[PDB]
């Protein structure tokens, strides 16, 4: 769990998570 | 006559004993829905601290069913348990500390 | 437990031969 | 089951207090 | 914390208390054949006043 | 034997210390006293129901009798008007009565 | 959400091998005096 | 401070004049079938109809939107940003949705009563914390559950006097 | 009078106390220094170790040993748990949130 | 005292198997978090070591004397019967009970009784054994396919019958009619609902006497019941004989 | 020195070695990340032993985290305002049950042939 790191999970999950709920609605 | 008497006798029991397995049988079934009835005539009539009866005993019921024991863990985490219980514990330390086992 | 002998009710009749 | 509601997991609701 | 995890755990603990069972009668049969072994308490009194 | 009661005083008995008819007298009484008062070494240990009555069946019993009991309150989507109220009488009790008040008037 | 038959019959089986207090063979020389002066001590 | 507003526009987010006047209708009309009130509205779920009923938001993240007084519900996992589960709010209409609407309007002045008392009672329900509903809504639902424990105990006890007959008879 | 019977014996604890030489040492009639004697060494404190033997040897079973506690074993009492870190991605979220 | 706790042996059973079926029950709430059920569980400890110790030919004429255990049988018999409000499950009052008069029929045989309201309470607690019903023999017949704990009360009465002393004289004055206890015993009598406790006791030890059963179906019953049959005969002769012969209205 | 209090209590003096045990064990250090001060924590008061399902119970759960936050008065007022307005509509001894004239001179010729 570091945000600041663009490789963790966190980054890229939370990115995939929002940009599939603007790309629903 | 007495062995007719006791020949009907003989004939009229077991048309006794079939009607008091069934007599058994709804007693039971009267029981059963005596606690169901208390059941929800407790939750009915205040529901929320039977709804708080009804967790505390049902979380407790799996301790005791499971075999574990012990103080509840939420509870002895703080500090005003060792400050409320502070004279049970001056003795219990006393007593490990003498025998030498702290 | 102990069920009821008959050494106890022996006992019984003794103390009401003996008084 | 459908027409029932969702429930709050209680067993992950431990989980992520401890860890917290 | 599910069932197959609750269960699991009363499997790592049944068998550590029938180990501790078994522990528990071979201290008390070394006591019965005259060899004094420790149990799972702690021996008791000594030799001072009480036996 | 069924020795006395001058055997059972305590003059003609043991006490915490610190002739020969006394110690013929006690030869009967804890010969008499003992198989009286000793416990039964076997089965018929129940003694009542109340005894033999078993806390872990029953609460697992009460366990599946409250969780059933509580999914037939709030799972059960059935409507208030809709839940259907059971019969007072059953289908032979309803035929008894038909009967016994046909015969009350002897 | 468990299966709590089974839950309970291992349960027995751990109630019955966890060590609650001493069995009959293994109390050792029971001494009554230092019985009857524990039970004057006032402790717990 | 947007938040009152916010709450205030998201329990009448999508129900024009007409919806609530079909939606009346169809609660006065009819008992305790809340999916033909929906098809009286149409364009409706019938928990979305029960939940505009008791005026209450939906998708569960307006309401807790933090995450004080909520003791637990912070620590409850969820779906983040998609995929709205609604826990509370369809445990609370599905607990609404069996309990007669007319005993409904009986048992709390905050549910909606007729076509011309929806403003004076949206006025009154205004500036209140989203905590406030939480608890309006919770309260409700418990109610209910009281009641239809009520139900089951009075069926509970015909069947213990059917019993009991069958015993004297016996 | 107690400090001294107390004082007096564990000087020589191998030595049996007797009440003769209390009553020769400290002025008072015999009868009550006889029962405070006889109260004092009915609770131990003084000949509670006249004759003291040696425990011979004890062969340890396994689990019955000082330092014999393993991390593996189940904590019955022991209230304080440990507990399972739950690592799912959607509750990483939450508790990188919280 | 307010009401004599004259509950009977099988409403006992009832209230315990109704309490302990019971969904929102208390009876394992522990040790370590209550003290109540602290004292409740060393009492009854107590009362299991004392029941248990009184099964040798030397602790059964040593424990009839001890004014210390005759006083904590008078002491106890006493919170049972009449204000049984502080123990906590109601299965500890019945094996209050249940183990009272086990150690007392042991001890009775040399047993000198030292209060009168100890003679009340001893048959209060003898009577509470068995099965009344709802003047004439207010005691349904106790069929002994069920428990033979009333027929350890028929031995109690049957050996503190036999002296003419503290032993007959106490029971003859409460069975027919220093200074606190009269306001007590007159409280105690008038609070049993004149000879209702005369006929109360024969009635009780007319039961534990199967006629019915041993006469309904021929010799291995009685040779079972001799004991129970004989020292209840003996305690009803004691009590026809020298209790009976005026203040009688029935 | 860890756990030694012989030897703690001599760094620190003046003090015996119970009093130092005592004043380690009552202090509050890992009450300020816990939840509450002393409403309630709910079903997560009882950790170790949770016996709820999402997909079995899905109702006992969210109902055992929502009675922490209502106030128990108000719905006992609204229960019995429920049962009270049911009652005031079902009207428009032991009448609630025989609410029929049927069943209650069945329940009377119950009663009179038990009698006779």
């Known amino acids: 769990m570091n945000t600041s790191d663009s490789e963790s999970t966190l980054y890229k999950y939370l990115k995939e998570s929002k940009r599939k709920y603007d790309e629903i609605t | 006559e007495l062995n007719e008497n006791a020949r009907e006798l003989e004939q009229i029991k077991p048309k006794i004993a079939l009607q008091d397995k069934e007599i058994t049988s709804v007693l039971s079934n009267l029981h059963e829905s005596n606690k169901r009835y208390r059941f929800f005539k407790k939750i009915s009539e205040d529901p929320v601290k039977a709804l708080n009866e009804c967790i505390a005993s049902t979380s407790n019921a799996l301790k005791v069913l499971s075999g574990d024991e012990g103080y509840n863990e939420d509870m002895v985490r703080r500090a005003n348990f060792y400050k409320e219980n502070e004279a049970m514990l001056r003795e219990n330390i006393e007593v490990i500390l003498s025998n030498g086992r702290m | 437990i102990r069920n009821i002998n008959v050494q106890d009710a022996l006992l019984t009749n003794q103390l009401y031969k003996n008084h | 089951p459908g027409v029932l509601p969702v429930g709050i997991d209680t067993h992950t609701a431990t989980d992520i207090y401890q860890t917290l | 914390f599910s069932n197959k995890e609750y269960i699991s755990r009363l499997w790592h603990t049944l068998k550590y208390y029938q180990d501790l069972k078994n522990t528990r009668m071979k201290s008390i049969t070394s006591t019965s054949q005259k060899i004094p072994s420790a149990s799972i308490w702690g021996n008791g009194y000594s030799g001072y006043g009480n036996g | ?106 | 959400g468990y299966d709590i038959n089974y839950i309970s019959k291992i349960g027995e089986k751990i109630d019955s091998n966890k060590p609650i207090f001493l069995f009959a063979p293994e109390l050792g020389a029971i001494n009554l005096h230092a019985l009857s002066m524990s039970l004057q001590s006032k402790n717990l | 401070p947007l938040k009152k507003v916010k709450i205030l526009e998201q329990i009448d987010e999508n129900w024009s004049k007409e919806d609530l006047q079909k939606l009346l209708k169809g609660i006065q009309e009819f008992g305790a079938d809340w999916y033909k009130v929906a098809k009286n509205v149409g364009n409706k779920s019938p928990e979305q109809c029960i939940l505009r009923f008791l005026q209450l938001p939906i998708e569960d993240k307006f309401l807790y939107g933090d995450g004080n007084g909520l003791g637990p519900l912070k620590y409850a996992p969820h779906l983040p940003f998609s995929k709205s589960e609604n826990p509370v709010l369809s445990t609370i209409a599905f607990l609404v949705g069996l309990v007669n609407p007319k005993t409904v309007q009986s048992m709390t002045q905050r549910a909606i009563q007729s076509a011309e008392s929806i403003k004076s009672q949206k006025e009154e329900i205004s500036d209140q914390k989203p905590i406030e509903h939480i608890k309006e809504g919770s309260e409700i639902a418990i109610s209910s559950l009281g009641y239809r424990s009520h139900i089951f105990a009075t069926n509970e006890e015909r069947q213990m006097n059917f019993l009991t007959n069958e015993l004297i008879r016996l | ?98 | 005292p307010l009401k004599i706790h004259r509950t009977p042996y099988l409403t006992s059973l009832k209230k315990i198997k109704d309490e302990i079926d019971d969904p929102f029950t208390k009876i394992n709430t522990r040790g370590a978090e209550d003290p109540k059920v602290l004292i409740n569980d060393q009492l009854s400890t107590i009362s299991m070591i004392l029941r248990n110790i009184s099964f040798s030919d030397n602790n059964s004429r040593i424990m009839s004397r001890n004014f210390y255990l005759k006083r904590f049988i008078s002491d106890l018999l006493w919170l049972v019967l009449i204000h049984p409000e502080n123990f906590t499950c109601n299965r500890k009052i019945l094996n209050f009970k249940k183990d009272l008069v086990i150690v007392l029929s042991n001890i009775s045989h040399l047993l000198e009784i030292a209060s009168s309201i100890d003679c009340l309470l001893i048959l209060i607690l003898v009577i509470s054994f068995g099965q009344p019903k709802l003047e004439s023999l207010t005691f349904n017949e106790f069929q002994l396919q069920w428990g033979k704990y009333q027929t350890f009360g028929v031995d109690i009465l049957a050996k503190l019958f036999s002296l003419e002393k503290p032993n007959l004289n106490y029971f003859k004055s409460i069975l027919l009619n220093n200074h606190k206890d009269k306001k007590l015993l007159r409280r105690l009598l008038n609070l049993y609902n004149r000879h209702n406790l005369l006929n109360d006791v024969v009635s009780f030890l007319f039961s534990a006497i199967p006629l019915q059963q041993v006469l309904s179906q021929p010799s291995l019953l009685i040779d079972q019941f001799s004991p129970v049959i004989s020292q209840s005969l003996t305690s009803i002769l004691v009590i026809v004989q020298k209790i009976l012969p005026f203040n009688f209205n029935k």
């Not at chain 6, 409507?79 to 009790?93: G, H």
């Open chain 9, 1 to 98: 009078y107690r400090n001294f019977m107390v004082n007096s014996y564990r000087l020589n604890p191998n030595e049996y106390f007797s009440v003769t030489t209390a009553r020769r040492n400290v002025s008072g009639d015999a009868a009550a220094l006889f029962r405070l004697h006889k109260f004092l060494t009915k609770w131990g404190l003084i000949n509670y170790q006249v004759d003291s033997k040696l425990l011979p040897k004890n062969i340890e079973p396994p689990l019955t040993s000082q330092y014999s506690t393993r991390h593996d074993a189940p904590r019955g009492l022991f209230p304080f748990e440990s507990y399972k870190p739950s690592v799912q991605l959607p509750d990483m979220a939450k508790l990188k949130k919280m």
């Open chain 6, 1 to 106: 034997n069924i020795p006395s009661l001058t055997s059972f005083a305590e003059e003609n008995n043991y006490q915490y210390g610190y002739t020969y008819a006394q110690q013929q007298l006690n030869k009967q009484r804890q010969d008499f006293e003992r198989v009286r008062l000793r416990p039964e070494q076997l089965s018929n240990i129940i003694h009542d129901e109340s005894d033999t009555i078993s806390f872990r069946s029953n609460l697992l019993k009460n366990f599946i009798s409250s969780n059933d009991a509580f999914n037939m309150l709030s799972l059960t989507t059935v409507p208030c008007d809709r839940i259907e109220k059971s019969r007072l009488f059953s289908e032979k009790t309803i035929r008894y009565l038909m009967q016994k008040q046909h015969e009350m008037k002897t």
